[PDB]
Amino acid sequence: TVEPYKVNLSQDLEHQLQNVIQELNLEIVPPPEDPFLPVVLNLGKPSQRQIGVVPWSPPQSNWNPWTSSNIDEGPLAYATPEQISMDLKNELMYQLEQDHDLQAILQERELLPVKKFESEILEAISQNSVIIIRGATGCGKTTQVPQFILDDFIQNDRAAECNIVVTQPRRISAVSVAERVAYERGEEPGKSCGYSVRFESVLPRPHASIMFCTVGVLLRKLEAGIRGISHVIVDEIHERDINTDFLLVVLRDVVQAYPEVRIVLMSATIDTSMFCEYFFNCPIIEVYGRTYPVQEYFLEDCIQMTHFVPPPANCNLICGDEYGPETRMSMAQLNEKETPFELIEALLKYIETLNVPGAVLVFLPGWNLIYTMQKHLEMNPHFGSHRYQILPLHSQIPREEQRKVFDPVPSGVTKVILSTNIAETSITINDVVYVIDSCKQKVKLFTAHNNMTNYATVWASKTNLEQRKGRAGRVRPGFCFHLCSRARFERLETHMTPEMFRTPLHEIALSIKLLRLGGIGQFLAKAIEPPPLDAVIEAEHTLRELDALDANDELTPLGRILAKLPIEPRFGKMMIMGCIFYVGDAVCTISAATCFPEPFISEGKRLGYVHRNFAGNRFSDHVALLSVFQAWDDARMGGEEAEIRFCEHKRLNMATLRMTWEAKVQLKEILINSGFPEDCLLTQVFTNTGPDNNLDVVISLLAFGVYPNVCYHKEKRKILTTEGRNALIHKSSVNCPFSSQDMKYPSPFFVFGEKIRTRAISAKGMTLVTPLQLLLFASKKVQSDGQIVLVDDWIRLQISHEAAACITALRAAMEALVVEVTKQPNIISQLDPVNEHMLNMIRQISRPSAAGINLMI
């Protein structure tokens, strides 16, 4: 157990709290008659009910479908479709006529398996409202089909009547495919091709254009409707991305009401009968090309071929008699929960002895096991520049480094790709003869009850291993090396659990309400495979708690704002609260930074003197974050090269800071348009060492945003979670003790970003908060016996009943103000003296000094 923490609160402040509560006429819960029966201090403190179909209209010559606005300037404002159609045709005919590098690219395009199905695909699309283009990965579904459709309208003098939307499940795919199709038309993105992912877009031209966006972005732009679009291409439907599954529900209603629209669903070689039945038994256009017979090998075959020996229910124990005693004895020593890196090294050295030039595609879960495998290889001098080109391929690296996987290598060098499941069905790498398959997947499991994020390394499906096996037989007779026992393969599920089954639904719930599609549960019931009940109940509960929905489950003015903001609704509300306190910029910066990896280059180690200094004396990763932005935004003043020098010298990832800043500008814009004043979102300079009340309030609002992630510090890295369970301070934290010197925290309480479950519970991105900040924002339920208070039945404080119930009343007073503010956001300019008195009182108890703490000593 742990003793109740004493909160040394001054007599002056305890009166001020009581005064404000009295001035606001707040119904404070009085003390208990006796101990043993404690009282809850929590103060509990609508629109008419409505199904609806998202409206549709075809392309128009004086309309820009991407900016969702009229063209009332330039030549295209008055110009007729016939002129635009001829102007765009003549331009393309002349380009193909001249550019010899473009002619060569078109000659590569015309060799892709999909090419010979061009006639049938175009014929199918023209006849039917919806079709499915099923076909193996590498035929050219993604890159060619949109072009075929566009060219067919250009060549047949109807370029003005074509505007294609193409949805991709991943961010990287939307941007990469746009860059790829642009190159294939001898352009950069911004002409015939463009992309619109989250916090980054390059808009294409208003006519005869393709938009490669993510589904999340499309849904956020449907508020007006699908106006000025001829075709909607939903790509990679087989991956079962939750937002894609959701869009198919929307699009089916759209097809039914507006059958003139054209929907093209594109899928790998899977059972597409589910989607066919869903879209009124639509046609399935089959696409195929040359494939070679790939030899399948499992963990037994690999260990035996390489004569491998590991260092110092389990399916590695189960092994057939048709194998060797040492093979069976060797395999048995391998832990299934880890990937054998030394075996992959042994498999690469075996691939050499076969004397058949070809690239090796190594499938791994995430950026960690790719980083680990890469580091492991470069240690051995054999896997050097002269003999091996080892290229990593995951989401969070520059596109320059990702483009290099397609580049040919000089003969004598082997191209080894250490990739995630991006290279499973989403992209095809050429000259791939060998595939080393870990047989694992990285999925984000989230259990709401304990607020546990688990980036788990779970088993892949049979369908996954069959698709990964097929990545070898596109050049010549290939080999696939599965690192799973022949027993384990039998125990694998046929298909991966679709995201709809195992993902929070509150972001989708808001989308449903914004687009006015009716009831959350009513709409999600129409899904191709509806989500489980508790996930819909959990979503409806989450949005009610935030006052995003009311008792009638109808969207509130607050809920409308949260829907438009593309971040966690809890961070969206934290930003709204931030605006009220005139710290809107800082909270927008913090909110943005959650969407990107850490700007620090720590390399999975403890932080150095340089990175730790950004934290100041606040014992906060979030203060460190805000501080690198202050330092970075100051360094940018001296041009681009000075920015690159600052980043290199301070070991910072420049691409991360730029994308995060860009995101902050876009979040800020959505608040401005929602009615919030300009001068409550200004970049206010701050100190991370000296007294700063604006930073005090940011950390108070942080506590709200990351709730229910709070923890208690015991000794060294060992911390106590909200479940009363043991957890660790993450190595990458500033609050992680460097070497043996134990940190003297002025408070044991920490709010934090993610509650990562691995071997043990690891709290990442930690910020120290006072016990007053704990009671104000980082708690829901509070019970008092008169002397002790019980915060969410996990930790106890020794604080005056009066102060604890008053701090609990401010929380309710703030919620009430947030509701009033969201009805008319411009009221934060001039507030009632009474409202500013409770804001000033929150500002007061946000201070360290308020809890008798001086961070400078």
Distances 735 to 81, 498, 617, 765, 841 between C-alpha atoms, Å: 63, 38, 10, 9, 29
- Three-class SS state of 420: coil
Among the listed residues 58, 59, 65, 140, the single contact to ligand ADP using CB under 6 A: 140
Contact between 485 and ligand ADP by CB under 6 A: the answer reads no
Give the span between the Cα atoms of 433 and 356, in whole angstroms: 9
In 397-451, beta strands by DSSP E = 414-419, 432-437, 440-447
Does 143 engage in binding with ligand ADP (CB under 6 A)?
yes
Q: Which is nearer to ligand A1BKZ, 60 or 822 (CB)?
A: 60
Among 217, 509, 510, 766, which residue sits at the site for ligand A1BKZ (rule: CB under 6 A)? 217
Number of residues that bind ligand A1BKZ (CB under 6 A): 18
Of the two residues 225 and 518, which places its CB atom closer to ligand A1BKZ in the complex? 225
Are the C-beta atoms of residues 469 and 294 closer than 8 Å to each other? yes
Residues 6+ apart with CB under 8 A from 146: 164, 166, 181, 210, 231, 233
CB closer to ligand ADP out of 3 and 108: 108
Neighbouring C-beta atoms of residue 254, cutoff 10 Å: 22
Residues 380-409, one symbol each (x = binds ligand ADP by CB under 6 A, - = not), give: --------------------------x---
Closest CB to ligand A1BKZ among 218 and 782?
218
Q: What is d(CA 558, CA 819) in angstroms, rounded to the nearest whole number? A: 7
Among 135, 138, 146, 228, contact with ligand A1BKZ (rule: CB under 6 A): 228
Report whether 569 contacts 510 (CB < 8 A).
yes
Residue 139 Cβ vs ligand ADP, minimum distance, rounded to whole Å:
4
Q: What is the C-alpha separation between 45 and 511, in angstroms, rounded?
A: 27
- Which pair of structure tokens corresponds to residue 442? 């990285």
Separation between Cα atoms, residue 786 and residue 358, nearest integer Å:
75
* Residue 229 touching ligand A1BKZ (CB under 6 A): yes
Residue 218 interface partner, choices ligand A1BKZ, Mg ion, ligand ADP, none, CB cut-off 5-8 Å depending on type: ligand A1BKZ
Site string for ligand A1BKZ, 812-841 (x = CB under 6 A): ------------------------------
Q: Is 137 in the site for ligand ADP (CB under 6 A)?
A: yes
Q: Which stretch binds ligand A1BKZ (CB under 6 A): 211-219, 248-256, 587-595, 728-736?
A: 211-219
Q: What is the dihedral of CA 571, 572, 575, 576, to 10 degrees?
A: -140
Question: What token pair was written down for 83?
Answer: 């002129």
Per the CB < 8 A criterion, the answer to whether 189 and 179 are in contact is: yes
Q: Tell me the per-residue interface mask from 50 to 69 with ligand A1BKZ, x by CB under 6 A, - otherwise.
A: ---------------xxxx-
63 forms beta bridges with 70
Q: Regarding beta strands 761-768 and 710-715, do their DSSP bridges make them parallel or antiparallel, or are they unpaired?
A: unpaired
CB of 200 to ligand A1BKZ, least distance (A): 9
Beta carbon of residue 186, minimum distance to ligand ADP (angstroms, whole number):
15
| 538-557 positions binding ligand A1BKZ, by CB under 6 A | none
Please state the separation of Cα 97 from the chain's center in Å.
Answer: 44
The answer to whether residue 291 forms part of the interface with ligand ADP (CB under 6 A) is no
Is residue 250 within the footprint of ligand A1BKZ (CB under 6 A)? Answer: no
Among the listed residues 89, 180, 185, 664, the single contact to ligand ADP using CB under 6 A: 180
Q: Choose between 112 and 284: whose C-beta lies nearer to ligand ADP.
A: 112
Q: What is the rounded distance in angstroms from the CA atom of residue 629 to the CA atom of residue 592? A: 12
Q: Is 70 in the site for ligand A1BKZ (CB under 6 A)?
A: no
Between residues 142 and 209, which has the closer beta carbon with respect to Mg ion? Answer: 142
Residue 146 binds to ligand ADP (criterion: CB under 6 A)? no
Q: Considering only residues 29, 40, 79, 112, which one is a binding residue for ligand ADP as defined by CB under 6 A? A: 112
Cβ neighbours of residue 366 closer than 8 Å, sequence gap 6 or more: 394, 420, 442, 455
> Would you give the distance in Å from CA 658 to the centre of its chain?
17
Side chain identity at residue 785, one-letter code: D
∠ CA 279-285-288, nearest 5°, is 140
Residues forming contacts to ligand ADP in the complex (CB under 6 A) are 112, 137-144, 180, 406, 427-428, 430
Residues forming contacts to ligand A1BKZ in the complex (CB under 6 A) are 65-68, 165, 196, 201, 203, 211, 213, 217-218, 221, 224, 226-229
